[PDB]
Amino acid sequence: ETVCVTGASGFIGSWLVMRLLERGYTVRATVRDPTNVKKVKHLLDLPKAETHLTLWKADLADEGSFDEAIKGCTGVFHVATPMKDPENEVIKPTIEGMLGIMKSCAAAKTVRRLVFTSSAGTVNIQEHQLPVYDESCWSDMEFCRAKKMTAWMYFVSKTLAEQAAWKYAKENNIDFITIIPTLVVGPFIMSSMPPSLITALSPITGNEAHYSIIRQGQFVHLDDLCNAHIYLFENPKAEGRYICSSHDCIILDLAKMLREKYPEYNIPTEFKGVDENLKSVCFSSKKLTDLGFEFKYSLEDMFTGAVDTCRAKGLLPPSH
Amino acid sequence: ETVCVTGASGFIGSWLVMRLLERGYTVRATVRDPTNVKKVKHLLDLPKAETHLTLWKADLADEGSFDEAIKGCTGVFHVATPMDFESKDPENEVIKPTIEGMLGIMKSCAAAKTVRRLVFTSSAGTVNIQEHQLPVYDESCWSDMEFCRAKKMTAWMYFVSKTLAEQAAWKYAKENNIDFITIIPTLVVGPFIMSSMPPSLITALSPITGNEAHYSIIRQGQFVHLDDLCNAHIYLFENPKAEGRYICSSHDCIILDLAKMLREKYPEYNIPTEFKGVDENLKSVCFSSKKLTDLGFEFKYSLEDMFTGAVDTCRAKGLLPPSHE
Ligand SMILES: NC(=O)c1ccc[n+]([C@@H]2O[C@H](COP(=O)([O-])OP(=O)(O)OC[C@H]3O[C@@H](n4cnc5c(N)ncnc54)[C@H](OP(=O)(O)O)[C@@H]3O)[C@@H](O)[C@H]2O)c1
Ligand SMILES: NC(=O)c1ccc[n+]([C@@H]2O[C@H](COP(=O)([O-])OP(=O)(O)OC[C@H]3O[C@@H](n4cnc5c(N)ncnc54)[C@H](OP(=O)(O)O)[C@@H]3O)[C@@H](O)[C@H]2O)c1
Ligand SMILES: O=c1c(O)c(-c2cc(O)c(O)c(O)c2)oc2cc(O)cc(O)c12
Ligand SMILES: O=c1c(O)c(-c2cc(O)c(O)c(O)c2)oc2cc(O)cc(O)c12
Ligand SMILES: O=c1c(O)c(-c2cc(O)c(O)c(O)c2)oc2cc(O)cc(O)c12
Ligand SMILES: O=c1c(O)c(-c2cc(O)c(O)c(O)c2)oc2cc(O)cc(O)c12
Numbered sequence: 159e160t161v162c163v164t165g166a167s168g169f170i171g172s173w174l175v176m177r178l179l180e181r182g183y184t185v186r187a188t189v190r191d192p193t194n195v196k197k198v199k200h201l202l203d204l205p206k207a208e209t210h211l212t213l214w215k216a217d218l219a220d221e222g223s224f225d226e227a228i229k230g231c232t233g234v235f236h237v238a239t240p241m242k243d244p245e246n247e248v249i250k251p252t253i254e255g256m257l258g259i260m261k262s263c264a265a266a267k268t269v270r271r272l273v274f275t276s277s278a279g280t281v282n283i284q285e286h287q288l289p290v291y292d293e294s295c296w297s298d299m300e301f302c303r304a305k306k307m308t309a310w311m312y313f314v315s316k317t318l319a320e321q322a323a324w325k326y327a328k329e330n331n332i333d334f335i336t337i338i339p340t341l342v343v344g345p346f347i348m349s350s351m352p353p354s355l356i357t358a359l360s361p362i363t364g365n366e367a368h369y370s371i372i373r374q375g376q377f378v379h380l381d382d383l384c385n386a387h388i389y390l391f392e393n394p395k396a397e398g399r400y401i402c403s404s405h406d407c408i409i410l411d412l413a414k415m416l417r418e419k420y421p422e423y424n425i426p427t428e429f430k431g432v433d434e435n436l437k438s439v440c441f442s443s444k445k446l447t448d449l450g451f452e453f454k455y456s457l458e459d460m461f462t463g464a465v466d467t468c469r470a471k472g473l474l475p476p477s478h
Numbered sequence: 479e480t481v482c483v484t485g486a487s488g489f490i491g492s493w494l495v496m497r498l499l500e501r502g503y504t505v506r507a508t509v510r511d512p513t514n515v516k517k518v519k520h521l522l523d524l525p526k527a528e529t530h531l532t533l534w535k536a537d538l539a540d541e542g543s544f545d546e547a548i549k550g551c552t553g554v555f556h557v558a559t560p561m562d563f564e565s566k567d568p569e570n571e572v573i574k575p576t577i578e579g580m581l582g583i584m585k586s587c588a589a590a591k592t593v594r595r596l597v598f599t600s601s602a603g604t605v606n607i608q609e610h611q612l613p614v615y616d617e618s619c620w621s622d623m624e625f626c627r628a629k630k631m632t633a634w635m636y637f638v639s640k641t642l643a644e645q646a647a648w649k650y651a652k653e654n655n656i657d658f659i660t661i662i663p664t665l666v667v668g669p670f671i672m673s674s675m676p677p678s679l680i681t682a683l684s685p686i687t688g689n690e691a692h693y694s695i696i697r698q699g700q701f702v703h704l705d706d707l708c709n710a711h712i713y714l715f716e717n718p719k720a721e722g723r724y725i726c727s728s729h730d731c732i733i734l735d736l737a738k739m740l741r742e743k744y745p746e747y748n749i750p751t752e753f754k755g756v757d758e759n760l761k762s763v764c765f766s767s768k769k770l771t772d773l774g775f776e777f778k779y780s781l782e783d784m785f786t787g788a789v790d791t792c793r794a795k796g797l798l799p800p801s802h803e
Binding site for chain 1: 518533534
């Protein structure tokens with residue numbers, strides 16, 4: 159059958175296409191610029207890309223642009239998201255894009271299910287942290303707007319887009335699933351540095367401005383995540399939002415896993431404002447596992463796959 | 479340094495890119511459709527493609543469409559031509575865009591300020607398409623447009639379109655002081671990197687496939703190895719003594735002589751021993767590459783080499799069966 163994947167040039171999108179191709183789907187991968195060799199080379203190099211992968215130019219800002227790509231699809235995987243005035247440059251596009259792709263799905267008449275990649279930023283952005291988050295939990299928009307932490311506009315954009323999308327999904331018998339990853343970490347097929355690896359390997363690179371997100375962190379392996387995407391597309395019992403997250407630990411525990419694996423790097427021992435009495439916040443993937451889905455990887459796997467791919471590509475120095 | 483290649487998806491263009499990249503050039507490949515996986519995958523998989531290759535969308539039918547790809551280039555290889563489909567409307571679908579697109583690219587080169595030389599791949603169909611065949615052709619010879627239009631033989635519109643484009647190009651070259659070179663290949667034969675069957679291999683391999691619609695082109699045939707041709711393109715771009723037109727052809731023989739060789743190498747195919755309307759006393763017609771070899775260029779490949787490479791590539795890609803019954 160034929161499935162569309164938006165944001166195929168990205169870290170999650172390209173890995174998902176790979177997996178969908180390996181499982182024997184015919185894939186329509188969307189990109190905003192098909193002439194960009196540094197993004198399409200990696201797509202066109204995937205197994206079965208010659209016979210089962212087609213490329214489609216589309217942009218979330220352009221109303222109707224996903225129309226033709228989606229027409230004749232049985233499934234859509236909406237992974238793409240827009241990345242000075244955030245309210246209009248990021249927020250509105252994301253919501254409109256989202257609706258735009260369900261409109262395009264309905265216009266298509268052939269889509270049986272739409273799977274949206276959401277964000278942990280839709281779940282736990284509030285001032286007080288619960289010890290365990292689940293799918294009934296939603297982020298606090300007034301806290302986002304009033305405090306404006308790093309990435310606030312992506313918290314707000316994805317929360318609003320997913321809620322706007324659920325409205326539409328119930329209205330129009332559009333059968334909609336959402337998957338909520340926490341920090342996605344793993345090897346990758348792209349030659350640019352995955353954004354979430356800038357955050358995950360921050361203990362190594364010393365990028366302080368990324369610590370807050372891993373102070374109390376949650377993690378999922380890219381391959382577990384893509385599988386979860388396909389599983390949920392297929393498994394017709396699937397309903398609702400699904401958290402996809404395999405590990406949680408505070409930054410001390412992360413950094414401590416890393417030091418032991420990577421003596422080679424200058425991985426600090428203590429972090430500002432972080433007691434060992436800091437509780438870890440877990441994202442419960444019970445709803446997903448109760449369906450039957452199983453996680454195949456470990457925190458160690460994630461960061462090994464990551465650091466190995468990053469050095470191989472010259473994105474990380476081999477030591478400090 | 480940076481050069482543009484038009485029609486980079488094709489048989490000649492894709493090999494030219496590969497050799498240009500291998501020689502340390504930065505290349506700007508143009509294509510009509512960059513989402514076409516079967517046209518771009520062979521390009522993006524070339525070594526150094528990630529760092530030294532960029533793609534650009536352009537069509538000879540669209541005015542100024544090559545401006546952006548060309549600006550910043552030091553050299554342009556114009557290899558593209560409308561030769562995709564049989565057309566019920568040759569004047570507008572073939573002839574017009576060939577001439578205008580040629581001119582439009584020369585203008586783009588003017589406007590770009592940075593282009594030291596434009597190299598155009600012409601065609602043996604601008605040279606020997608006339609009712610009477612001379613024994614040897616050289617760069618002074620030009621096809622007979624009244625003969626073409628009178629007879630309307632197969633491919634008449636490509637003979638006409640290239641002839642009028644090159645003649646228009648030469649006029650424009652002189653009037654605007656552009657360093658212009660034309661290369662006139664004969665039938666191009668060899669291995670290749672594209673996934674579909676090269677149009678010229680349909681013609682070249684016709685004694686094996688039995689596609690009699692192509693025999694008239696090879697009745698009195700002339701040939702050049704693809705890699706020799708592409709080397710000649712580079713050689714000519716770089717060689718500062720290059721001027722005017724250049725024939726690039728390394729072999730000639732009549733179809734009987736071609737079929738003999740192919741029967742010898744490939745007993746597994748059913749290659750005819752006779753051809754209606756051809757006897758052993760038929761004159762071979764040579765295209766003379768002396769102007770090119772006089773500059774210093776040396777051909778490396780033989781006729782056997784050309785055909786072995788074409789046949790093995792076609793087999794490997796499943797474009798020819800391994801044998802007949
Ligand atoms: N990685 C994580 O830790 C993580 C965690 C939770 C959720 N997510 C979600 O996962 C998705 C994938 O993120 P990722 O980390 O794979 O990011 P990425 O590697 O940065 O990929 C993002 C994709 O978005 C596309 N895109 C950006 N603007 C677009 C536009 N205006 N129209 C169409 N496409 C556009 C980009 O395509 P081009 O640049 O080719 O145009 C790119 O392919 C995002 O929705 C994100 O919110 C990620
Ligand atoms: N092959 C030979 O035996 C031989 C002999 C003498 C001369 N030539 C000359 O060599 C050149 C290339 O021939 P080839 O054998 O490589 O043929 P080819 O494989 O068909 O390649 C020609 C290219 O022209 C491009 N094209 C078609 N219409 C176009 C248009 N409207 N705008 C821009 N590009 C267009 C196509 O690229 P896209 O489809 O990506 O856009 C195609 O890749 C031609 O100019 C021909 O006259 C060839
Ligand atoms: O670069 C960042 C980023 O992209 C996101 C992000 C968060 C989400 O919830 C999303 O849904 C999303 O698409 C992106 O968060 C961040 C949080 C930080 O503390 C620091 C960062 O550098 C980022
Ligand atoms: O999309 C992203 C995302 O959701 C989160 C995130 C992870 C968590 O573990 C959370 O608890 C949380 O609230 C947000 O971080 C990110 C960091 C990046 O660099 C880039 C991203 O795209 C995300
Ligand atoms: O398919 C053909 C073709 O493409 C050309 C051709 C000839 C030229 O001179 C050109 O300059 C050109 O671009 C194409 O000739 C042909 C001649 C035939 O008898 C039969 C054919 O099938 C072709
Ligand atoms: O471009 C082409 C071309 O020039 C010739 C050609 C070859 C000769 O040897 C001649 O003497 C002649 O007059 C024309 O054939 C071709 C055959 C194809 O199938 C495709 C082509 O593109 C050409």
